[PDB]
Amino acid sequence: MPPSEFLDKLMGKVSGYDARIRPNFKGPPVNVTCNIFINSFGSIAETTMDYRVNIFLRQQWNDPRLAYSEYPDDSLDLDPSMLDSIWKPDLFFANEKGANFHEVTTDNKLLRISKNGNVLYSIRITLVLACPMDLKNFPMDVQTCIMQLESFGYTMNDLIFEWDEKGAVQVADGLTLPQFILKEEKDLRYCTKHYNTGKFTCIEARFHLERQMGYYLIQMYIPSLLIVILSWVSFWINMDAAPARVGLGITTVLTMTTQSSGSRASLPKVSYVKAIDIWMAVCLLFVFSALLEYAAVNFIARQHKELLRFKTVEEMRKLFISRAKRIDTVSRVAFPLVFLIFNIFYWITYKIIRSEDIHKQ
Amino acid sequence: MPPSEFLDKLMGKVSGYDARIRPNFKGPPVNVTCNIFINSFGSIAETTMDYRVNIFLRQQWNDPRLAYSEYPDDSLDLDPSMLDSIWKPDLFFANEKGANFHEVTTDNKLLRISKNGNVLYSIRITLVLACPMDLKNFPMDVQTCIMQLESFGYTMNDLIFEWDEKGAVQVADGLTLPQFILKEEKDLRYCTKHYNTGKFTCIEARFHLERQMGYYLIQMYIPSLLIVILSWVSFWINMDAAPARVGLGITTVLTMTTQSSGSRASLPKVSYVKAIDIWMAVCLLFVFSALLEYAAVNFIARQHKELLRFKTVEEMRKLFISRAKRIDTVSRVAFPLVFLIFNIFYWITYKIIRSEDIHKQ
Amino acid sequence: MPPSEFLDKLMGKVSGYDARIRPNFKGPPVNVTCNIFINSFGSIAETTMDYRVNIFLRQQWNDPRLAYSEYPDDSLDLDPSMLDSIWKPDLFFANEKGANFHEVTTDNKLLRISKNGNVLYSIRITLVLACPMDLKNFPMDVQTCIMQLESFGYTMNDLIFEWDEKGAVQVADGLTLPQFILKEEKDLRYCTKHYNTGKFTCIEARFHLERQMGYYLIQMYIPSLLIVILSWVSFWINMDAAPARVGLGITTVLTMTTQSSGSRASLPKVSYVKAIDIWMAVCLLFVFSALLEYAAVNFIARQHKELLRFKTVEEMRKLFISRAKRIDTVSRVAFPLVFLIFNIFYWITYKIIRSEDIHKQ
Amino acid sequence: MPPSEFLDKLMGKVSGYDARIRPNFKGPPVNVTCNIFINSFGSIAETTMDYRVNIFLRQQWNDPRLAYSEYPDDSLDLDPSMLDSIWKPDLFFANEKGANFHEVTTDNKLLRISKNGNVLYSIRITLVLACPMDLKNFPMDVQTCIMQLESFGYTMNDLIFEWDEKGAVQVADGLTLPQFILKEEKDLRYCTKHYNTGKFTCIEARFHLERQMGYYLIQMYIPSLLIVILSWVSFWINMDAAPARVGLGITTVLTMTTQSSGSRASLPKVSYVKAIDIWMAVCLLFVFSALLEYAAVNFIARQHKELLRFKTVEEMRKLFISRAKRIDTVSRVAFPLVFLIFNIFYWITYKIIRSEDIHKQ
Amino acid sequence: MPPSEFLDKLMGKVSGYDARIRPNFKGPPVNVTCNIFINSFGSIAETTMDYRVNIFLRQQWNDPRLAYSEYPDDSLDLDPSMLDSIWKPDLFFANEKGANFHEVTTDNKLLRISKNGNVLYSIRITLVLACPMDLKNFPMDVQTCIMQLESFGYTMNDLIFEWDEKGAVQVADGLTLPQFILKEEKDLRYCTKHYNTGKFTCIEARFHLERQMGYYLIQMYIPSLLIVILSWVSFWINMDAAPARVGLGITTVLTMTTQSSGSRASLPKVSYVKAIDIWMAVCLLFVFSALLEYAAVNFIARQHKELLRFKTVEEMRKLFISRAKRIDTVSRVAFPLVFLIFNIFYWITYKIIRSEDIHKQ
Ligand SMILES: *[C@@H]1O[C@H](CO)[C@@H](O)[C@H](O)[C@H]1NC(C)=O
Ligand SMILES: *[C@@H]1O[C@H](CO)[C@@H](O)[C@H](O)[C@H]1NC(C)=O
Ligand SMILES: *[C@@H]1O[C@H](CO)[C@@H](O)[C@H](O)[C@H]1NC(C)=O
Ligand SMILES: *[C@@H]1O[C@H](CO)[C@@H](O)[C@H](O)[C@H]1NC(C)=O
Ligand SMILES: *[C@@H]1O[C@H](CO)[C@@H](O)[C@H](O)[C@H]1NC(C)=O
């Protein structure tokens, strides 16, 4: 008994199978369960607000036709090249920045058909997907990225889409991201779409990504800290008159402004203020304040010298010098202390907000 | 009663339906109403003078043929793969920098046909569209970007294009741009096209975009301001003779020129002068003037020393020193004041011009 | 009388029309007049020596066959999808860096056919075209960019190509370039091509582009000028002994060399010397000469001090000091004056050469 | 005896050869031996975690059908265009970032068929392949890059894939990489894949790449060393009071931080600390310590001057000056010595770890 | 006598012409002469080790069939669209990084057929070709770039490829490269390919490219020279004690290291040392030596001052001062002289090696 005669028997010009007609026509909507296997997640760009994922898409539906009930085997794996002679549903992705099918050697496809009529359809697809990330807290944040599967041409009365009760979303073993940690939560919900044309089914899968803090420390938090320490050296060491303190102050201020511009390089231009902006602004304020402190002490020394040119005169020299030394020593102790206070509030507030986000999620 | 026989009945080799002939041939022009749904606007580049939009294009026309008048249902949703056996009109976009159709799984298409013959055609298309933006006022401006729909092969005597009276242009809910704010005005007008070949229909949709000012402040207005403040420190603090004031002046001038080059980085090269150029030029003039002020006071001190080497001599020392201190103190008070006057005129004039633009729009 | 029967009548399997045979076979060459409409010129890159233009290409030829002489209408607009059943000529562009046909919705094409047999063929095509620009004078120059239309497979005995006597090249109204001004001259000439395979027709269209000077002034001519002024301050202000004049000199020299590298950034690497290179070299020479002047005066002061350590001694102090002051004052007056002389010769010579180029053009 | 009749005889509509049915249907799995020839390896990017290889893929399987047993010749080379009328297996690459078939002139393909039924299939394919490299030791490391060949649509009961016993992987003669050295080991192992759909065959080939150290020395190890030497000059030469030592210290610290940012430019952002980060951190610590040393000696000189303003006084001047000179001389000798100790431990530990890696490999 | 009947007569279903069978089947190998016309060479990138060339490929072979011997004309130009009904050979390019066929308007192709059966086939093809350039001497070198034409599916017993005896490689008139000079030598040799599958024909064409030295002088040889001159000013001008000589030395060293990194920007990372690296290393050594010289003289002045604090004392002041002045003057004369000696050896050795290379070529 040849397989060929069976293959054209089911689907052919002698069979009444029209591939342009939905199963259960003039009937209850076609229920379709959708399964996702993630082969390779990654390539997340804040500039373009998108990420690229290579997935395996499995969708199962039951057709009343194509129930063979002849061969002694429950299921049979069929050729991928015959997938044009059946009723595949029309499933697109809403937030799509273009996608390409895989044609390495033969088509990366799969067809299976059971005795009752159940069809299993599996497709490999690279999907560039748009994620509108919110960078309110840039180095420490959780981003939720959306995958939506929708019916372009069929309203709710036909082709309803559902998720799979067990193992709807899977991930390949040992799949890692250099910048992000994928969270094994993957909350699944469905949001229907309303248009003037009609009401169309959609189902959504949500992925949670946290940011590694290892890179951001070394790149942008340690060097800014070092520049603040460099500004700190001027107070406890250099004499009141120096052609170097002004140099140290201008070099530290200029490097901080270049570093501040540096931080906003990969980042897209956005109106709101990020956490990294708050840190760089405070460090720039500290360095600027250090230069202004030296400026104030130099000016007090100028009054000492101006009065000096004009015993009774000796009484005021000591008070100006004591004032200059007093403000120098108090600056010396105060600026690392107030920097420490800023660090403990900044770090604990971002820690708590980090805990806070999961409740909304 | 099989649907298949009906489907080939209407459009087939037994029917007299030629898909190469316009409806109402040798007759009144085919009226076509066009509806636009914007799925994802964005990716606006000043360098290439263009933006990329993913839209849904709906065009409705009435064909005297294809009026079925048989089934008890007013409208029927038909297969997308049979869209090659009918008369679609020829609609292209004039300002097009290339476009790609969507082929995720099955074709993203839609066909509906009513009892009278009304056809609804809906297509998903990513369109890179050319916008010739005018950057006379770069950080604060409104840009108008054009979408034009035109008939390539049919003159005005056939295939007239019209807009939809209600809801011609829609936008997906919660659609945002990081740099721009889309305005909910969307004025619709039609501009016919004249060629040596003929006169061809066109309709146009206009979008208004304003620029977020949050990024531009932090990136380019605050740092330039800080450099001007740094130039200001020299006057009220440093002594008349210093190997540091010249350093502070050269570092501030050099950083301002680098920042001025920095501002014109994303921007395309253009002949005219932008608002940001005016601001950077004035700040550079202020920093340069601060260095020149120190230069003038140093020169006056040189005359004091030159005369000093040559009582009657004591009379002129006081006048040179008083002249140096007087010009120093007056510089000290004057430069932030005149900077404040420049800021209030610059900001109010761009505020009023900002109000002014809407009248032309 | 159905249009369909006429349409297959002219071009069909019952007609003797072979689309693989040229009209007037074994006869006089097929004359073809070519008309160009420029929809969007632009995107001119010196790096890749090319520009991208979106055009409308219209070519008209007469076929002795296809003369219908039946319908009461002189001309008829036919379907674009039937353009594969006729004799289109083979026209390629010689200086082509690849091109893409437009497939937004339906094919952007056009067919018309008159009573005598005249065929009008109109095609929309984006063409990346290679322009070998000569940058001898970089900021001020006129570039001539070439479009060539050639026959790949037919020698001169067949398919001769001609231009259109009136309106051969048109440009869309209100079409502008940010960097260039297109000139409304558009000289048309034909240059035949000789190969070992044969002699092939070609026709050429030439476009003249001048460079806007607005960007280049602000970006590269004003800042270099400012650096020269900064070098100038040292002479008229700073004392003979200073730990600042050396700073001002090294900062100005280093910034000029960075700016000189900056100018050659977009530019392709070329052996010959550009005008901008001449300007940056002269300004760098001026800044270097200013540092060398300070160096010479410092050395003369060193001889004054060396002789001072060793009245009769008093006689030579005055001559060394007078020599130092004299060379300082003469440097002070001379360097802006000789800079002015360089500017007037440089600007008038490029002005005259600018006038000169049109004669060759 | 015409070849044509034989060609359609074997594979044709009169033969019972269905190309949609696997050989040995309802039988033992199809054994397939796979041979790889590497034409051009290269283009290894750490940013995208991938490499691009152009290969020749040869797979041999035996079909019980297609055994001609007629012609006197054992093997015959057949047309590449007839490769659509046979049973090619479905082989994809798991870690695939897209691939393109070669269509220069005619298809780059090959078919051979022996008397028994053995089929040889050879295909040229450029493969962008994902390599998840581990940069724990960035300049000196061995990276293992994976090629996996898998069956998309056939479970283990059919289409088993095996390697070739002799010469499974070959490399073109004189094939070199600028950055890497390919190792002639190429360990071959097979890892089966388990899915909810089924169990699918896979075979894997592993390539070992070491990094050339020539570039990294010149680019990043010699310049950082030079900056440390520059910091070293301050101790043995410059006087205790100087407006230059602070300059030399700030310039060296700022250049080291810029160089540290420079090193992490091509590199993807990663949480863990690389070897190059360890080296740059230690050199930055040395330069910072040199500036702090000068700071400490300047402060000791300040106590000497402060006590000096207030014989018995003469006794303490000598002790402060001797303390300043002693710490200066001991800094002078100590810092190159402790730098040498850091270099010998760093280099030997990376040497041993380099030897260590091969055991895991 | 219609041409159409002749056209299907030769190649058709009534003729015995099978396009899947080689001419002279079971016979002597098909000799194929190959002619290359280079339309536009260029776009040579050291980073990707490749160049892009647009060529015309002409291959002539004799088929015993297709000898018409009917029409009074020796040769006839046939339609390009019928090139699928004949035996084109299978010619690919070995070192191929992908290629695209030209489809501007109609196919850029050509067919001619003579009375004897000679076929002329001409194709336009843009080829990105891999050139493994050796950068041992980077600014001055000759690079040899390889084009190989090979048979993918046919072993040596069939389809032998040969070059054309006269005019095998041509170049379009007035074709220039901005960076390179093409040499009119173009040595042609054939290298057969051996595989486990078989032995396959190949022929190779070699192009010689020299580098223009105009850009490299202005960009990287003149500025480094200027920095060395700047280092030279310190010796002959500045006093022994200065807060400026250290500045001039650190600025020159830092700019040289940035310029050294600058030179290796376009260049791919390679282990070996280039000529430009040798020049930048020697100039960096000179600048470093200048700073060390100032350091040594400052230290000798320190011994003079240290001994001064402790007549008999007057005797040693003169010897330390004379030692400092002597080493200063000898440094002054010596460093430009030894720089001149380095320049004459470096330039003559690269001159001779430049002559030397042609012998290997
Ligand atoms: C899909 O599921 C719904 C809910 O159980 C059911 O009402 C509907 O009939 C199903 N569709 C079928 C069986 O075609
Ligand atoms: C389109 O509308 C115009 C204006 O009402 C009308 O004159 C014309 O007949 C319409 N075209 C049709 C009905 O085909
Ligand atoms: C094209 O024009 C030339 C010049 O007038 C003429 O000799 C030739 O016959 C024309 N070709 C035709 C009419 O096919
Ligand atoms: C493949 O090899 C295995 C192991 O020897 C064998 O059991 C199996 O029958 C083979 N498959 C065939 C011959 O189709
Ligand atoms: C090709 O040339 C070789 C060398 O002259 C010759 O032996 C062979 O027969 C030729 N092939 C033909 C004529 O098919």
PDB file of N, CA and C in Angstrom, chain E residues 68-116:
ATOM      1  N   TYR E  68      23.406  26.296 -36.558  1.00  0.00           N
ATOM      2  CA  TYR E  68      22.203  26.483 -37.362  1.00  0.00           C
ATOM      3  C   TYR E  68      22.433  26.241 -38.850  1.00  0.00           C
ATOM      4  N   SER E  69      23.437  26.899 -39.440  1.00  0.00           N
ATOM      5  CA  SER E  69      23.805  26.767 -40.864  1.00  0.00           C
ATOM      6  C   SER E  69      22.632  26.997 -41.825  1.00  0.00           C
ATOM      7  N   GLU E  70      21.859  28.055 -41.576  1.00  0.00           N
ATOM      8  CA  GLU E  70      20.675  28.305 -42.391  1.00  0.00           C
ATOM      9  C   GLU E  70      20.667  29.767 -42.830  1.00  0.00           C
ATOM     10  N   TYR E  71      20.618  30.688 -41.869  1.00  0.00           N
ATOM     11  CA  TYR E  71      20.578  32.119 -42.166  1.00  0.00           C
ATOM     12  C   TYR E  71      21.845  32.594 -42.874  1.00  0.00           C
ATOM     13  N   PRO E  72      21.724  33.541 -43.813  1.00  0.00           N
ATOM     14  CA  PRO E  72      22.900  34.131 -44.475  1.00  0.00           C
ATOM     15  C   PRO E  72      23.833  34.947 -43.579  1.00  0.00           C
ATOM     16  N   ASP E  73      23.604  35.040 -42.271  1.00  0.00           N
ATOM     17  CA  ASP E  73      24.400  35.871 -41.379  1.00  0.00           C
ATOM     18  C   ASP E  73      25.189  34.972 -40.442  1.00  0.00           C
ATOM     19  N   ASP E  74      26.480  35.285 -40.286  1.00  0.00           N
ATOM     20  CA  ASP E  74      27.380  34.452 -39.491  1.00  0.00           C
ATOM     21  C   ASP E  74      26.998  34.395 -38.012  1.00  0.00           C
ATOM     22  N   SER E  75      26.632  35.525 -37.420  1.00  0.00           N
ATOM     23  CA  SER E  75      26.312  35.590 -36.003  1.00  0.00           C
ATOM     24  C   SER E  75      24.992  36.315 -35.803  1.00  0.00           C
ATOM     25  N   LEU E  76      24.298  35.980 -34.720  1.00  0.00           N
ATOM     26  CA  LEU E  76      23.018  36.602 -34.422  1.00  0.00           C
ATOM     27  C   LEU E  76      22.940  36.880 -32.931  1.00  0.00           C
ATOM     28  N   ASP E  77      22.465  38.071 -32.568  1.00  0.00           N
ATOM     29  CA  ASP E  77      22.279  38.412 -31.165  1.00  0.00           C
ATOM     30  C   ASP E  77      20.888  37.984 -30.721  1.00  0.00           C
ATOM     31  N   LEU E  78      20.832  37.131 -29.709  1.00  0.00           N
ATOM     32  CA  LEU E  78      19.592  36.539 -29.239  1.00  0.00           C
ATOM     33  C   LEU E  78      19.141  37.165 -27.924  1.00  0.00           C
ATOM     34  N   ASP E  79      17.859  36.950 -27.621  1.00  0.00           N
ATOM     35  CA  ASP E  79      17.202  37.487 -26.431  1.00  0.00           C
ATOM     36  C   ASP E  79      17.944  37.035 -25.172  1.00  0.00           C
ATOM     37  N   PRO E  80      18.114  37.895 -24.167  1.00  0.00           N
ATOM     38  CA  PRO E  80      18.656  37.405 -22.889  1.00  0.00           C
ATOM     39  C   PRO E  80      17.719  36.491 -22.110  1.00  0.00           C
ATOM     40  N   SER E  81      16.402  36.578 -22.303  1.00  0.00           N
ATOM     41  CA  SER E  81      15.470  35.771 -21.516  1.00  0.00           C
ATOM     42  C   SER E  81      15.450  34.299 -21.906  1.00  0.00           C
ATOM     43  N   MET E  82      16.105  33.914 -22.996  1.00  0.00           N
ATOM     44  CA  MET E  82      16.142  32.526 -23.431  1.00  0.00           C
ATOM     45  C   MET E  82      17.411  31.813 -22.993  1.00  0.00           C
ATOM     46  N   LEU E  83      18.187  32.420 -22.095  1.00  0.00           N
ATOM     47  CA  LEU E  83      19.443  31.859 -21.614  1.00  0.00           C
ATOM     48  C   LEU E  83      19.252  30.714 -20.632  1.00  0.00           C
ATOM     49  N   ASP E  84      18.019  30.319 -20.351  1.00  0.00           N
ATOM     50  CA  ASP E  84      17.738  29.215 -19.460  1.00  0.00           C
ATOM     51  C   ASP E  84      17.534  27.918 -20.219  1.00  0.00           C
ATOM     52  N   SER E  85      17.499  27.980 -21.547  1.00  0.00           N
ATOM     53  CA  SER E  85      17.275  26.814 -22.386  1.00  0.00           C
ATOM     54  C   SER E  85      18.543  26.325 -23.070  1.00  0.00           C
ATOM     55  N   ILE E  86      19.715  26.568 -22.486  1.00  0.00           N
ATOM     56  CA  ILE E  86      20.978  26.124 -23.059  1.00  0.00           C
ATOM     57  C   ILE E  86      21.882  25.644 -21.933  1.00  0.00           C
ATOM     58  N   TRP E  87      23.073  25.194 -22.310  1.00  0.00           N
ATOM     59  CA  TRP E  87      24.067  24.686 -21.369  1.00  0.00           C
ATOM     60  C   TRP E  87      25.042  25.808 -21.042  1.00  0.00           C
ATOM     61  N   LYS E  88      24.717  26.590 -20.079  1.00  0.00           N
ATOM     62  CA  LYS E  88      25.740  27.444 -19.499  1.00  0.00           C
ATOM     63  C   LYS E  88      26.647  26.603 -18.606  1.00  0.00           C
ATOM     64  N   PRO E  89      27.944  26.880 -18.540  1.00  0.00           N
ATOM     65  CA  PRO E  89      28.787  26.166 -17.577  1.00  0.00           C
ATOM     66  C   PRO E  89      28.576  26.700 -16.165  1.00  0.00           C
ATOM     67  N   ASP E  90      29.134  25.986 -15.186  1.00  0.00           N
ATOM     68  CA  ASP E  90      28.992  26.380 -13.783  1.00  0.00           C
ATOM     69  C   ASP E  90      30.295  27.017 -13.309  1.00  0.00           C
ATOM     70  N   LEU E  91      30.331  28.340 -13.280  1.00  0.00           N
ATOM     71  CA  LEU E  91      31.543  29.050 -12.913  1.00  0.00           C
ATOM     72  C   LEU E  91      31.239  29.866 -11.676  1.00  0.00           C
ATOM     73  N   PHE E  92      31.952  29.595 -10.601  1.00  0.00           N
ATOM     74  CA  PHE E  92      31.835  30.378  -9.389  1.00  0.00           C
ATOM     75  C   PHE E  92      33.180  31.013  -9.097  1.00  0.00           C
ATOM     76  N   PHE E  93      33.195  31.921  -8.140  1.00  0.00           N
ATOM     77  CA  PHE E  93      34.433  32.527  -7.692  1.00  0.00           C
ATOM     78  C   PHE E  93      34.746  31.999  -6.306  1.00  0.00           C
ATOM     79  N   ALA E  94      35.963  31.471  -6.142  1.00  0.00           N
ATOM     80  CA  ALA E  94      36.355  30.839  -4.888  1.00  0.00           C
ATOM     81  C   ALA E  94      36.368  31.833  -3.736  1.00  0.00           C
ATOM     82  N   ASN E  95      37.143  32.910  -3.862  1.00  0.00           N
ATOM     83  CA  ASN E  95      37.246  33.873  -2.769  1.00  0.00           C
ATOM     84  C   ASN E  95      36.098  34.873  -2.885  1.00  0.00           C
ATOM     85  N   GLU E  96      34.900  34.400  -2.582  1.00  0.00           N
ATOM     86  CA  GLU E  96      33.707  35.213  -2.736  1.00  0.00           C
ATOM     87  C   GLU E  96      33.056  35.546  -1.407  1.00  0.00           C
ATOM     88  N   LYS E  97      32.846  36.832  -1.150  1.00  0.00           N
ATOM     89  CA  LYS E  97      32.107  37.244   0.031  1.00  0.00           C
ATOM     90  C   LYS E  97      30.696  37.673  -0.345  1.00  0.00           C
ATOM     91  N   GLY E  98      30.117  37.027  -1.342  1.00  0.00           N
ATOM     92  CA  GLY E  98      28.783  37.267  -1.854  1.00  0.00           C
ATOM     93  C   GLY E  98      28.784  38.151  -3.090  1.00  0.00           C
ATOM     94  N   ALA E  99      27.823  37.905  -3.982  1.00  0.00           N
ATOM     95  CA  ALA E  99      27.722  38.661  -5.221  1.00  0.00           C
ATOM     96  C   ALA E  99      26.253  38.812  -5.580  1.00  0.00           C
ATOM     97  N   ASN E 100      25.942  39.875  -6.315  1.00  0.00           N
ATOM     98  CA  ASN E 100      24.591  40.154  -6.786  1.00  0.00           C
ATOM     99  C   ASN E 100      24.514  40.381  -8.287  1.00  0.00           C
ATOM    100  N   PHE E 101      23.556  39.733  -8.932  1.00  0.00           N
ATOM    101  CA  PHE E 101      23.324  39.933 -10.349  1.00  0.00           C
ATOM    102  C   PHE E 101      22.620  41.279 -10.545  1.00  0.00           C
ATOM    103  N   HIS E 102      22.750  41.846 -11.736  1.00  0.00           N
ATOM    104  CA  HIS E 102      22.169  43.147 -12.069  1.00  0.00           C
ATOM    105  C   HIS E 102      20.836  42.992 -12.785  1.00  0.00           C
ATOM    106  N   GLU E 103      19.797  43.612 -12.230  1.00  0.00           N
ATOM    107  CA  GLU E 103      18.448  43.550 -12.773  1.00  0.00           C
ATOM    108  C   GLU E 103      17.851  44.926 -13.052  1.00  0.00           C
ATOM    109  N   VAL E 104      18.680  45.921 -13.379  1.00  0.00           N
ATOM    110  CA  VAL E 104      18.170  47.237 -13.761  1.00  0.00           C
ATOM    111  C   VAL E 104      17.451  47.064 -15.083  1.00  0.00           C
ATOM    112  N   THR E 105      16.164  47.445 -15.120  1.00  0.00           N
ATOM    113  CA  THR E 105      15.244  47.236 -16.243  1.00  0.00           C
ATOM    114  C   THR E 105      15.363  45.744 -16.538  1.00  0.00           C
ATOM    115  N   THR E 106      15.765  45.382 -17.737  1.00  0.00           N
ATOM    116  CA  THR E 106      15.862  43.990 -18.139  1.00  0.00           C
ATOM    117  C   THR E 106      17.224  43.449 -17.706  1.00  0.00           C
ATOM    118  N   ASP E 107      17.330  42.115 -17.632  1.00  0.00           N
ATOM    119  CA  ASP E 107      18.571  41.385 -17.338  1.00  0.00           C
ATOM    120  C   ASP E 107      19.772  41.916 -18.109  1.00  0.00           C
ATOM    121  N   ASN E 108      20.879  42.130 -17.403  1.00  0.00           N
ATOM    122  CA  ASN E 108      22.114  42.546 -18.061  1.00  0.00           C
ATOM    123  C   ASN E 108      22.849  41.289 -18.481  1.00  0.00           C
ATOM    124  N   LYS E 109      22.561  40.854 -19.702  1.00  0.00           N
ATOM    125  CA  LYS E 109      23.028  39.594 -20.248  1.00  0.00           C
ATOM    126  C   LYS E 109      23.229  39.787 -21.739  1.00  0.00           C
ATOM    127  N   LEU E 110      23.744  38.753 -22.390  1.00  0.00           N
ATOM    128  CA  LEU E 110      24.071  38.816 -23.805  1.00  0.00           C
ATOM    129  C   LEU E 110      24.290  37.399 -24.288  1.00  0.00           C
ATOM    130  N   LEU E 111      23.721  37.087 -25.442  1.00  0.00           N
ATOM    131  CA  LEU E 111      23.926  35.805 -26.092  1.00  0.00           C
ATOM    132  C   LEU E 111      24.242  36.038 -27.555  1.00  0.00           C
ATOM    133  N   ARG E 112      25.260  35.354 -28.053  1.00  0.00           N
ATOM    134  CA  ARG E 112      25.550  35.334 -29.472  1.00  0.00           C
ATOM    135  C   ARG E 112      25.871  33.900 -29.848  1.00  0.00           C
ATOM    136  N   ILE E 113      25.591  33.532 -31.094  1.00  0.00           N
ATOM    137  CA  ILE E 113      25.750  32.159 -31.580  1.00  0.00           C
ATOM    138  C   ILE E 113      26.174  32.246 -33.038  1.00  0.00           C
ATOM    139  N   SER E 114      27.261  31.560 -33.379  1.00  0.00           N
ATOM    140  CA  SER E 114      27.827  31.560 -34.715  1.00  0.00           C
ATOM    141  C   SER E 114      27.397  30.320 -35.495  1.00  0.00           C
ATOM    142  N   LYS E 115      27.871  30.239 -36.744  1.00  0.00           N
ATOM    143  CA  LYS E 115      27.462  29.180 -37.663  1.00  0.00           C
ATOM    144  C   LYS E 115      28.011  27.830 -37.233  1.00  0.00           C
ATOM    145  N   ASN E 116      29.228  27.820 -36.701  1.00  0.00           N
ATOM    146  CA  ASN E 116      29.877  26.596 -36.257  1.00  0.00           C
ATOM    147  C   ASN E 116      29.319  26.077 -34.943  1.00  0.00           C
TER     148      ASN E 116
END
